[PDB]
Amino acid sequence: YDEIFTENIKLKLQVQEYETEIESLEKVIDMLQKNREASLEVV
Amino acid sequence: YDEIFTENIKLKLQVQEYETEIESLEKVIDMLQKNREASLEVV
Amino acid sequence: QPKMITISGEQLNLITENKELMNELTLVSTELAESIKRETELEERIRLYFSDFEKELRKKSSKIVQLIQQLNDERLKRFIAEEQLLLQENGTKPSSMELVGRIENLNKLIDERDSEIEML
Amino acid sequence: ITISGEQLNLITENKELMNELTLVSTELAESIKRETELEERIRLYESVSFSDFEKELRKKSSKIVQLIQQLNDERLKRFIAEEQLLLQENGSSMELVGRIENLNKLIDERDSEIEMLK
Amino acid sequence: QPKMITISGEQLNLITENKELMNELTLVSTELAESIKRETELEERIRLYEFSDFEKELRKKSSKIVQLIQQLNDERLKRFIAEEQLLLQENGTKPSSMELVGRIENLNKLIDERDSEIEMLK
Amino acid sequence: TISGEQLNLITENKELMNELTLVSTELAESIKRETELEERIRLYETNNSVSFSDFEKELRKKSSKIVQLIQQLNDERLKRFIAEEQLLLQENGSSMELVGRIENLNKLIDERDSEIEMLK
Predict the structure, then answer these.
(1) Between chains, do F65 and E24 touch, taking CB under 8 Å as contact?
(2) Please, what other remarks does the record include (chain D)?
(3) Is residue A1 part of a domain?
(4) Nearest-neighbour CA in chain A from B33: distance (Å)
(5) Among D77, E66, E103, F117, which one is least packed by beta carbons within 10 Å?
Protein backbone atom coordinates (compact mmCIF):
# COMPACT_ATOMS: atom_id res chain seq x y z
CA TYR A 1 0.00 0.00 0.00
CA ASP A 2 1.01 3.61 0.66
CA GLU A 3 1.77 3.15 4.37
CA ILE A 4 4.32 0.55 3.27
CA PHE A 5 5.77 3.27 1.05
CA THR A 6 5.75 5.62 4.06
CA GLU A 7 8.01 3.36 6.13
CA ASN A 8 10.03 3.17 2.90
CA ILE A 9 10.79 6.87 3.54
CA LYS A 10 11.68 7.30 7.22
CA LEU A 11 13.70 4.08 7.34
CA LYS A 12 15.45 5.06 4.11
CA LEU A 13 16.48 8.14 6.12
CA GLN A 14 16.96 6.46 9.52
CA VAL A 15 19.66 4.38 7.83
CA GLN A 16 21.57 7.48 6.66
CA GLU A 17 21.86 8.90 10.21
CA TYR A 18 23.21 5.71 11.77
CA GLU A 19 25.67 5.51 8.85
CA THR A 20 27.10 8.83 10.06
CA GLU A 21 26.78 8.03 13.75
CA ILE A 22 28.81 4.89 13.02
CA GLU A 23 31.33 7.10 11.20
CA SER A 24 31.64 9.64 14.01
CA LEU A 25 32.42 6.91 16.54
CA GLU A 26 35.26 5.73 14.32
CA LYS A 27 36.41 9.35 14.09
CA VAL A 28 36.88 9.42 17.86
CA ILE A 29 38.26 5.87 18.29
CA ASP A 30 40.90 6.61 15.63
CA MET A 31 41.84 10.02 17.05
CA LEU A 32 41.43 8.75 20.64
CA GLN A 33 43.91 5.88 20.98
CA LYS A 34 46.60 8.00 19.31
CA ASN A 35 45.77 10.65 21.93
CA ARG A 36 46.22 8.26 24.86
CA GLU A 37 49.65 7.32 23.54
CA ALA A 38 50.41 11.00 22.86
CA SER A 39 50.26 11.54 26.63
CA LEU A 40 53.05 8.99 27.20
CA GLU A 41 54.92 10.63 24.30
CA VAL A 42 54.76 14.01 26.05
CA VAL A 43 55.14 12.33 29.45
CA TYR B 1 4.34 -2.10 -5.78
CA ASP B 2 5.97 -5.08 -4.11
CA GLU B 3 9.62 -4.14 -4.69
CA ILE B 4 8.75 -1.15 -2.49
CA PHE B 5 7.66 -3.80 0.03
CA THR B 6 10.97 -5.67 -0.27
CA GLU B 7 12.83 -2.44 0.50
CA ASN B 8 10.90 -2.49 3.78
CA ILE B 9 11.80 -6.10 4.47
CA LYS B 10 15.54 -5.34 4.09
CA LEU B 11 15.71 -1.84 5.59
CA LYS B 12 14.03 -3.06 8.78
CA LEU B 13 16.96 -5.48 9.09
CA GLN B 14 19.68 -3.08 7.93
CA VAL B 15 18.51 -0.62 10.59
CA GLN B 16 18.56 -3.34 13.26
CA GLU B 17 22.16 -4.33 12.52
CA TYR B 18 23.20 -0.68 12.66
CA GLU B 19 21.33 -0.38 15.96
CA THR B 20 23.49 -2.98 17.73
CA GLU B 21 26.68 -1.67 16.14
CA ILE B 22 25.93 1.70 17.74
CA GLU B 23 25.29 0.28 21.21
CA SER B 24 28.36 -1.94 20.79
CA LEU B 25 30.42 1.10 19.77
CA GLU B 26 29.51 3.01 22.92
CA LYS B 27 30.14 -0.19 24.90
CA VAL B 28 33.82 0.12 23.87
CA ILE B 29 33.83 3.85 24.67
CA ASP B 30 32.33 3.63 28.17
CA MET B 31 34.96 0.99 29.04
CA LEU B 32 37.86 3.38 28.31
CA GLN B 33 37.11 5.86 31.11
CA LYS B 34 37.51 2.72 33.23
CA ASN B 35 40.70 1.89 31.34
CA ARG B 36 41.86 5.52 31.39
CA GLU B 37 41.86 5.49 35.19
CA ALA B 38 43.44 2.05 35.68
CA SER B 39 46.47 3.24 33.70
CA LEU B 40 46.97 6.59 35.45
CA GLU B 41 46.26 4.63 38.65
CA VAL B 42 49.26 2.39 37.87
CA VAL B 43 51.25 4.89 35.77
CA GLN C 1 30.36 32.12 40.97
CA PRO C 2 33.05 29.85 39.46
CA LYS C 3 34.55 32.28 36.91
CA MET C 4 37.29 34.32 38.70
CA ILE C 5 38.66 37.10 36.43
CA THR C 6 38.75 40.80 37.32
CA ILE C 7 39.60 42.98 34.29
CA SER C 8 40.82 41.29 31.06
CA GLY C 9 38.65 43.84 29.22
CA GLU C 10 35.69 43.05 26.96
CA GLN C 11 36.35 39.31 27.32
CA LEU C 12 34.43 39.19 30.59
CA ASN C 13 31.71 41.06 28.69
CA LEU C 14 31.96 37.98 26.42
CA ILE C 15 32.59 35.07 28.79
CA THR C 16 29.91 35.99 31.33
CA GLU C 17 27.66 36.34 28.27
CA ASN C 18 28.51 32.93 26.80
CA LYS C 19 27.85 31.31 30.18
CA GLU C 20 24.34 32.82 30.13
CA LEU C 21 23.38 31.23 26.82
CA MET C 22 24.85 27.95 28.07
CA ASN C 23 22.87 28.08 31.34
CA GLU C 24 19.90 29.10 29.16
CA LEU C 25 20.25 26.63 26.28
CA THR C 26 19.64 23.79 28.74
CA LEU C 27 16.53 25.70 29.84
CA VAL C 28 14.96 25.77 26.37
CA SER C 29 15.96 22.13 25.83
CA THR C 30 14.62 20.68 29.09
CA GLU C 31 11.48 22.82 28.91
CA LEU C 32 11.04 21.44 25.38
CA ALA C 33 11.64 17.87 26.59
CA GLU C 34 8.75 18.39 29.00
CA SER C 35 6.75 19.46 25.94
CA ILE C 36 7.61 16.65 23.52
CA LYS C 37 6.83 13.88 26.02
CA ARG C 38 3.29 15.21 26.47
CA GLU C 39 2.65 14.82 22.73
CA THR C 40 3.18 11.08 23.17
CA GLU C 41 0.89 11.19 26.22
CA LEU C 42 -1.55 12.55 23.63
CA GLU C 43 -0.31 10.34 20.78
CA GLU C 44 -0.46 7.11 22.80
CA ARG C 45 -3.73 8.59 24.08
CA ILE C 46 -5.14 8.66 20.55
CA ARG C 47 -4.85 4.96 19.72
CA LEU C 48 -7.44 4.03 22.23
CA TYR C 49 -8.99 7.29 20.91
CA PHE C 50 -0.46 13.55 4.51
CA SER C 51 1.11 14.56 1.23
CA ASP C 52 3.77 12.02 0.29
CA PHE C 53 5.65 14.29 -2.15
CA GLU C 54 6.44 16.67 0.73
CA LYS C 55 6.27 14.40 3.80
CA GLU C 56 9.88 13.45 3.01
CA LEU C 57 11.24 16.98 2.54
CA ARG C 58 9.67 18.03 5.87
CA LYS C 59 11.65 15.21 7.51
CA LYS C 60 14.77 15.38 5.32
CA SER C 61 14.97 18.93 6.67
CA SER C 62 14.96 17.36 10.15
CA LYS C 63 17.19 14.42 9.20
CA ILE C 64 19.98 16.69 7.93
CA VAL C 65 20.30 18.70 11.17
CA GLN C 66 20.54 15.31 12.85
CA LEU C 67 23.56 14.45 10.72
CA ILE C 68 25.35 17.64 11.77
CA GLN C 69 24.18 17.23 15.39
CA GLN C 70 25.64 13.72 15.70
CA LEU C 71 28.88 14.73 13.95
CA ASN C 72 29.11 17.84 16.14
CA ASP C 73 28.35 15.84 19.29
CA GLU C 74 31.22 13.40 18.75
CA ARG C 75 34.05 15.73 17.71
CA LEU C 76 33.12 17.77 20.79
CA LYS C 77 32.80 14.80 23.14
CA ARG C 78 36.37 13.96 22.14
CA PHE C 79 37.30 17.59 22.83
CA ILE C 80 36.44 16.67 26.43
CA ALA C 81 38.45 13.42 26.34
CA GLU C 82 41.92 14.96 26.11
CA GLU C 83 41.08 17.97 28.27
CA GLN C 84 39.63 15.79 31.01
CA LEU C 85 42.62 13.49 30.47
CA LEU C 86 45.12 16.32 30.98
CA LEU C 87 43.24 17.27 34.15
CA GLN C 88 43.35 13.74 35.57
CA GLU C 89 46.96 14.03 34.36
CA ASN C 90 47.82 17.40 35.94
CA GLY C 91 45.96 16.42 39.17
CA THR C 92 46.03 12.80 40.40
CA LYS C 93 43.14 11.50 42.63
CA PRO C 94 40.28 13.18 44.48
CA SER C 95 38.70 14.56 41.33
CA SER C 96 38.45 18.29 41.00
CA MET C 97 36.02 17.09 38.29
CA GLU C 98 33.09 15.89 40.39
CA LEU C 99 33.53 18.84 42.76
CA VAL C 100 33.20 21.63 40.18
CA GLY C 101 30.52 19.39 38.67
CA ARG C 102 28.50 18.98 41.85
CA ILE C 103 29.25 22.67 42.50
CA GLU C 104 27.75 23.85 39.21
CA ASN C 105 24.61 21.71 39.50
CA LEU C 106 24.17 23.29 42.95
CA ASN C 107 24.00 26.85 41.61
CA LYS C 108 21.35 25.60 39.17
CA LEU C 109 19.09 24.37 41.96
CA ILE C 110 19.65 27.68 43.75
CA ASP C 111 19.05 29.36 40.39
CA GLU C 112 15.96 27.13 40.07
CA ARG C 113 14.74 28.07 43.57
CA ASP C 114 15.84 31.71 43.91
CA SER C 115 13.86 32.36 40.72
CA GLU C 116 10.86 30.91 42.55
CA ILE C 117 11.55 33.22 45.51
CA GLU C 118 10.95 35.93 42.89
CA MET C 119 7.90 34.14 41.48
CA LEU C 120 6.33 34.31 44.96
CA ILE D 1 44.27 40.24 32.83
CA THR D 2 46.20 37.83 30.57
CA ILE D 3 43.93 38.60 27.60
CA SER D 4 46.21 36.46 25.40
CA GLY D 5 47.26 33.56 27.62
CA GLU D 6 43.68 32.47 27.03
CA GLN D 7 43.42 32.70 23.36
CA LEU D 8 40.76 30.39 22.09
CA ASN D 9 39.92 27.98 24.84
CA LEU D 10 36.95 27.93 24.30
CA ILE D 11 33.46 29.20 24.43
CA THR D 12 34.53 31.70 21.82
CA GLU D 13 32.31 32.59 18.88
CA ASN D 14 28.73 32.30 20.13
CA LYS D 15 27.65 32.93 16.52
CA GLU D 16 27.02 29.17 16.68
CA LEU D 17 25.91 29.02 20.33
CA MET D 18 22.97 31.33 19.67
CA ASN D 19 22.27 29.37 16.46
CA GLU D 20 21.45 26.24 18.47
CA LEU D 21 19.36 28.50 20.70
CA THR D 22 17.29 29.52 17.67
CA LEU D 23 17.17 26.03 16.11
CA VAL D 24 15.80 24.80 19.46
CA SER D 25 13.24 27.54 20.06
CA THR D 26 12.00 26.67 16.57
CA GLU D 27 11.74 22.96 17.29
CA LEU D 28 10.00 24.24 20.41
CA ALA D 29 7.82 26.37 18.12
CA GLU D 30 6.73 23.43 15.96
CA SER D 31 5.96 21.47 19.15
CA ILE D 32 3.14 23.24 21.01
CA LYS D 33 1.33 23.70 17.70
CA ARG D 34 2.07 20.04 16.95
CA GLU D 35 0.46 19.20 20.29
CA THR D 36 -2.48 21.65 20.21
CA GLU D 37 -3.78 20.02 17.00
CA LEU D 38 -3.79 16.60 18.67
CA GLU D 39 -5.08 18.11 21.93
CA GLU D 40 -7.85 19.73 19.90
CA ARG D 41 -8.66 16.56 17.95
CA ILE D 42 -9.28 14.60 21.15
CA ARG D 43 -10.99 17.66 22.62
CA LEU D 44 -13.11 17.76 19.46
CA TYR D 45 -13.55 13.97 19.78
CA GLU D 46 -14.45 13.60 23.46
CA SER D 47 -1.78 10.95 6.62
CA VAL D 48 -1.25 14.01 8.80
CA SER D 49 -1.63 12.13 12.09
CA PHE D 50 1.12 9.66 11.18
CA SER D 51 3.33 12.44 9.81
CA ASP D 52 3.32 14.31 13.12
CA PHE D 53 3.84 11.08 15.07
CA GLU D 54 7.09 10.47 13.17
CA LYS D 55 7.91 14.17 12.73
CA GLU D 56 7.97 14.48 16.51
CA LEU D 57 10.05 11.27 16.51
CA ARG D 58 12.77 13.45 14.96
CA LYS D 59 12.75 16.32 17.47
CA LYS D 60 13.41 13.91 20.36
CA SER D 61 16.65 12.54 18.87
CA SER D 62 17.47 16.19 17.97
CA LYS D 63 17.14 17.70 21.46
CA ILE D 64 18.58 14.53 23.02
CA VAL D 65 21.70 15.37 21.04
CA GLN D 66 21.78 19.02 22.13
CA LEU D 67 20.96 18.15 25.75
CA ILE D 68 24.12 16.05 25.39
CA GLN D 69 25.84 18.89 23.49
CA GLN D 70 25.71 21.24 26.48
CA LEU D 71 26.63 18.51 28.98
CA ASN D 72 29.85 17.78 27.11
CA ASP D 73 30.31 21.44 26.17
CA GLU D 74 29.85 21.93 29.91
CA ARG D 75 32.14 19.03 30.80
CA LEU D 76 34.59 20.55 28.33
CA LYS D 77 34.09 23.94 30.03
CA ARG D 78 34.46 22.53 33.55
CA PHE D 79 38.08 21.71 32.84
CA ILE D 80 39.84 24.20 30.57
CA ALA D 81 38.76 26.62 33.29
CA GLU D 82 41.35 24.87 35.47
CA GLU D 83 43.67 24.54 32.48
CA GLN D 84 43.75 28.35 32.67
CA LEU D 85 43.82 28.89 36.44
CA LEU D 86 46.66 26.38 36.84
CA LEU D 87 48.67 27.95 34.00
CA GLN D 88 47.73 31.09 35.96
CA GLU D 89 48.36 31.15 39.72
CA ASN D 90 46.11 28.41 41.18
CA GLY D 91 42.72 26.72 41.01
CA SER D 92 41.87 24.02 45.14
CA SER D 93 40.10 20.90 46.45
CA MET D 94 39.96 22.27 50.00
CA GLU D 95 38.57 25.51 48.54
CA LEU D 96 35.79 23.96 46.44
CA VAL D 97 34.62 21.62 49.21
CA GLY D 98 34.52 24.93 51.04
CA ARG D 99 31.98 26.37 48.64
CA ILE D 100 29.84 23.21 48.57
CA GLU D 101 29.50 23.29 52.36
CA ASN D 102 28.22 26.88 52.25
CA LEU D 103 25.96 26.26 49.24
CA ASN D 104 23.98 23.42 50.83
CA LYS D 105 23.59 25.62 53.91
CA LEU D 106 22.43 28.41 51.59
CA ILE D 107 20.14 25.94 49.79
CA ASP D 108 18.65 24.73 53.07
CA GLU D 109 18.29 28.33 54.23
CA ARG D 110 16.61 29.21 50.93
CA ASP D 111 14.69 25.94 51.07
CA SER D 112 13.72 27.12 54.55
CA GLU D 113 12.42 30.52 53.39
CA ILE D 114 10.48 28.55 50.78
CA GLU D 115 8.74 26.41 53.42
CA MET D 116 7.71 29.52 55.40
CA LEU D 117 5.89 31.57 52.76
CA LYS D 118 4.07 28.45 51.53
CA GLN E 1 59.23 -18.74 15.09
CA PRO E 2 58.27 -16.08 17.70
CA LYS E 3 56.39 -18.53 19.90
CA MET E 4 58.85 -20.21 22.31
CA ILE E 5 56.93 -21.59 25.35
CA THR E 6 59.21 -24.61 25.20
CA ILE E 7 57.79 -26.96 27.87
CA SER E 8 55.20 -25.34 30.18
CA GLY E 9 53.45 -28.71 30.45
CA GLU E 10 50.96 -29.82 27.80
CA GLN E 11 49.27 -26.46 27.14
CA LEU E 12 51.77 -25.98 24.30
CA ASN E 13 49.71 -28.42 22.23
CA LEU E 14 46.83 -25.94 22.51
CA ILE E 15 48.28 -22.50 21.68
CA THR E 16 50.05 -24.18 18.76
CA GLU E 17 46.90 -25.93 17.43
CA ASN E 18 45.04 -22.62 17.27
CA LYS E 19 47.81 -20.58 15.66
CA GLU E 20 47.41 -23.45 13.16
CA LEU E 21 43.66 -22.76 12.87
CA MET E 22 43.66 -18.96 12.90
CA ASN E 23 46.09 -18.89 9.97
CA GLU E 24 43.87 -21.55 8.42
CA LEU E 25 40.96 -19.18 9.07
CA THR E 26 42.47 -16.08 7.46
CA LEU E 27 43.45 -18.34 4.55
CA VAL E 28 39.77 -19.32 4.15
CA SER E 29 38.48 -15.79 4.77
CA THR E 30 40.88 -14.64 2.04
CA GLU E 31 39.31 -17.36 -0.11
CA LEU E 32 35.68 -16.42 0.53
CA ALA E 33 36.39 -12.78 -0.36
CA GLU E 34 37.68 -13.65 -3.83
CA SER E 35 34.57 -15.59 -4.87
CA ILE E 36 32.31 -12.67 -3.89
CA LYS E 37 34.62 -10.48 -5.98
CA ARG E 38 34.27 -13.11 -8.72
CA GLU E 39 30.50 -13.04 -8.07
CA THR E 40 29.64 -9.33 -7.96
CA GLU E 41 31.81 -9.12 -11.08
CA LEU E 42 29.35 -11.55 -12.66
CA GLU E 43 26.41 -9.68 -11.13
CA GLU E 44 27.40 -6.68 -13.27
CA ARG E 45 27.10 -8.66 -16.51
CA ILE E 46 23.79 -10.03 -15.22
CA ARG E 47 22.72 -6.40 -14.72
CA LEU E 48 23.52 -5.85 -18.41
CA TYR E 49 20.65 -8.26 -19.21
CA GLU E 50 17.56 -6.17 -18.45
CA PHE E 51 10.72 -13.64 -4.58
CA SER E 52 8.80 -15.39 -1.77
CA ASP E 53 8.72 -12.48 0.69
CA PHE E 54 7.56 -14.43 3.75
CA GLU E 55 9.96 -17.28 2.89
CA LYS E 56 12.81 -14.86 2.02
CA GLU E 57 12.84 -13.54 5.59
CA LEU E 58 13.72 -16.90 7.15
CA ARG E 59 16.90 -17.16 5.07
CA LYS E 60 17.82 -13.50 5.72
CA LYS E 61 16.90 -12.96 9.38
CA SER E 62 19.08 -16.02 10.02
CA SER E 63 22.13 -14.61 8.23
CA LYS E 64 21.65 -11.29 10.04
CA ILE E 65 21.57 -13.08 13.40
CA VAL E 66 25.29 -13.83 13.27
CA GLN E 67 25.93 -10.24 12.21
CA LEU E 68 24.48 -8.88 15.47
CA ILE E 69 26.67 -11.48 17.19
CA GLN E 70 29.65 -10.45 15.06
CA GLN E 71 29.65 -6.68 15.68
CA LEU E 72 28.95 -7.39 19.35
CA ASN E 73 31.88 -9.80 19.02
CA ASP E 74 34.11 -7.53 16.91
CA GLU E 75 33.75 -4.67 19.38
CA ARG E 76 34.62 -6.99 22.28
CA LEU E 77 38.02 -8.01 20.90
CA LYS E 78 38.49 -4.39 19.81
CA ARG E 79 38.40 -3.59 23.54
CA PHE E 80 40.97 -6.15 24.70
CA ILE E 81 43.43 -5.16 21.95
CA ALA E 82 43.53 -1.43 22.68
CA GLU E 83 44.04 -2.05 26.42
CA GLU E 84 46.50 -4.96 26.30
CA GLN E 85 48.38 -2.68 23.90
CA LEU E 86 48.72 -0.04 26.62
CA LEU E 87 49.79 -2.52 29.32
CA LEU E 88 52.71 -3.33 26.96
CA GLN E 89 53.14 0.23 25.64
CA GLU E 90 53.55 1.40 29.24
CA ASN E 91 56.20 -1.29 29.52
CA GLY E 92 57.35 -0.65 25.96
CA THR E 93 58.55 2.95 26.34
CA LYS E 94 58.78 4.31 22.73
CA PRO E 95 60.30 2.89 19.52
CA SER E 96 57.46 0.41 18.98
CA SER E 97 57.93 -2.63 21.21
CA MET E 98 54.93 -4.31 19.52
CA GLU E 99 54.98 -3.16 15.87
CA LEU E 100 58.20 -5.14 15.41
CA VAL E 101 56.27 -8.41 15.78
CA GLY E 102 53.56 -6.94 13.54
CA ARG E 103 56.04 -6.59 10.70
CA ILE E 104 57.30 -10.09 11.53
CA GLU E 105 54.05 -11.97 11.03
CA ASN E 106 53.55 -10.23 7.70
CA LEU E 107 56.93 -11.67 6.70
CA ASN E 108 56.39 -15.14 8.21
CA LYS E 109 53.14 -15.24 6.22
CA LEU E 110 54.99 -14.63 2.95
CA ILE E 111 57.60 -17.29 3.82
CA ASP E 112 54.84 -19.88 4.11
CA GLU E 113 53.31 -18.44 0.94
CA ARG E 114 56.64 -19.01 -0.80
CA ASP E 115 56.77 -22.45 0.82
CA SER E 116 53.48 -23.19 -0.93
CA GLU E 117 54.97 -22.12 -4.26
CA ILE E 118 57.94 -24.45 -3.78
CA GLU E 119 55.52 -27.07 -2.45
CA MET E 120 53.30 -26.84 -5.52
CA LEU E 121 56.56 -26.59 -7.48
CA LYS E 122 57.50 -29.84 -5.61
CA THR F 1 54.59 -21.71 34.90
CA ILE F 2 51.07 -22.63 33.91
CA SER F 3 48.19 -21.31 36.13
CA GLY F 4 49.98 -17.98 36.09
CA GLU F 5 48.70 -16.46 32.84
CA GLN F 6 45.34 -18.09 33.56
CA LEU F 7 43.28 -16.56 30.75
CA ASN F 8 46.13 -15.14 28.64
CA LEU F 9 43.94 -14.91 25.55
CA ILE F 10 43.99 -17.95 23.25
CA THR F 11 41.39 -19.86 25.28
CA GLU F 12 38.19 -21.60 24.11
CA ASN F 13 39.23 -23.61 21.05
CA LYS F 14 35.80 -25.08 20.36
CA GLU F 15 34.98 -21.43 19.69
CA LEU F 16 37.89 -21.22 17.23
CA MET F 17 36.84 -24.29 15.25
CA ASN F 18 33.36 -22.72 15.19
CA GLU F 19 34.36 -19.70 13.09
CA LEU F 20 36.28 -21.94 10.70
CA THR F 21 33.32 -24.19 9.88
CA LEU F 22 31.22 -21.06 9.25
CA VAL F 23 33.54 -19.56 6.62
CA SER F 24 33.95 -22.99 5.03
CA THR F 25 30.17 -23.36 5.33
CA GLU F 26 29.81 -19.89 3.77
CA LEU F 27 32.35 -20.78 1.08
CA ALA F 28 29.99 -23.50 -0.15
CA GLU F 29 27.23 -20.89 -0.06
CA SER F 30 29.12 -18.43 -2.27
CA ILE F 31 30.07 -20.94 -4.98
CA LYS F 32 26.54 -22.21 -5.65
CA ARG F 33 25.60 -18.57 -6.19
CA GLU F 34 28.56 -18.13 -8.56
CA THR F 35 27.55 -21.13 -10.66
CA GLU F 36 23.87 -20.39 -11.39
CA LEU F 37 25.05 -16.85 -12.15
CA GLU F 38 27.86 -18.14 -14.38
CA GLU F 39 25.24 -20.36 -16.00
CA ARG F 40 22.51 -17.74 -16.27
CA ILE F 41 24.95 -15.54 -18.21
CA ARG F 42 25.91 -18.02 -20.94
CA LEU F 43 22.16 -18.57 -21.25
CA TYR F 44 21.89 -14.89 -22.23
CA GLU F 45 24.55 -15.32 -24.94
CA THR F 46 23.15 -18.58 -26.29
CA ASN F 47 19.39 -18.15 -25.90
CA ASN F 48 19.76 -14.64 -27.35
CA SER F 49 12.80 -12.79 -7.41
CA VAL F 50 15.25 -15.65 -7.00
CA SER F 51 17.75 -13.50 -8.91
CA PHE F 52 17.08 -10.60 -6.54
CA SER F 53 17.30 -12.91 -3.50
CA ASP F 54 20.66 -14.62 -4.08
CA PHE F 55 21.69 -11.00 -4.54
CA GLU F 56 20.45 -10.05 -1.07
CA LYS F 57 21.85 -13.30 0.30
CA GLU F 58 25.34 -12.42 -0.98
CA LEU F 59 25.54 -8.76 0.11
CA ARG F 60 24.79 -10.16 3.57
CA LYS F 61 27.75 -12.55 3.36
CA LYS F 62 29.91 -9.64 2.16
CA SER F 63 29.65 -8.25 5.70
CA SER F 64 30.05 -11.54 7.60
CA LYS F 65 33.40 -12.14 5.90
CA ILE F 66 34.28 -8.45 6.29
CA VAL F 67 33.50 -8.96 9.98
CA GLN F 68 35.63 -12.08 10.46
CA LEU F 69 38.63 -10.69 8.58
CA ILE F 70 38.30 -7.70 10.91
CA GLN F 71 37.56 -10.10 13.77
CA GLN F 72 40.48 -12.35 12.88
CA LEU F 73 42.95 -9.46 12.64
CA ASN F 74 41.87 -8.11 16.03
CA ASP F 75 41.90 -11.72 17.24
CA GLU F 76 45.58 -12.10 16.34
CA ARG F 77 46.69 -8.50 16.96
CA LEU F 78 45.59 -8.93 20.56
CA LYS F 79 47.72 -12.11 20.77
CA ARG F 80 51.10 -10.58 19.86
CA PHE F 81 50.45 -7.92 22.50
CA ILE F 82 49.52 -10.57 25.11
CA ALA F 83 52.40 -12.88 24.18
CA GLU F 84 54.80 -10.09 25.14
CA GLU F 85 53.17 -9.25 28.47
CA GLN F 86 53.54 -12.86 29.63
CA LEU F 87 57.17 -13.03 28.51
CA LEU F 88 57.98 -9.76 30.28
CA LEU F 89 56.36 -10.97 33.52
CA GLN F 90 58.51 -14.07 32.98
CA GLU F 91 62.04 -13.25 31.85
CA ASN F 92 61.68 -10.95 28.82
CA GLY F 93 60.47 -10.60 25.26
CA SER F 94 63.17 -7.77 23.24
CA SER F 95 63.60 -4.50 21.34
CA MET F 96 66.83 -5.83 19.79
CA GLU F 97 66.19 -9.47 18.80
CA LEU F 98 62.87 -8.50 17.20
CA VAL F 99 64.83 -6.27 14.83
CA GLY F 100 67.39 -9.02 14.22
CA ARG F 101 65.07 -11.81 13.08
CA ILE F 102 63.28 -9.34 10.78
CA GLU F 103 66.48 -8.82 8.76
CA ASN F 104 67.23 -12.54 8.43
CA LEU F 105 63.55 -13.12 7.62
CA ASN F 106 63.92 -10.85 4.58
CA LYS F 107 66.95 -12.96 3.64
CA LEU F 108 64.60 -15.92 4.00
CA ILE F 109 62.20 -14.25 1.57
CA ASP F 110 65.15 -13.66 -0.77
CA GLU F 111 66.74 -17.11 -0.53
CA ARG F 112 63.25 -18.55 -1.04
CA ASP F 113 62.54 -16.45 -4.13
CA SER F 114 65.82 -17.60 -5.67
CA GLU F 115 64.43 -21.13 -5.94
CA ILE F 116 61.10 -19.81 -7.26
CA GLU F 117 62.82 -18.51 -10.40
CA MET F 118 65.12 -21.56 -10.31
CA LEU F 119 62.49 -24.17 -11.16
CA LYS F 120 60.65 -21.97 -13.65
Answers:
(1) no
(2) Present with 166 molecules/cell in log phase SD medium.
(3) no
(4) 11
(5) F117
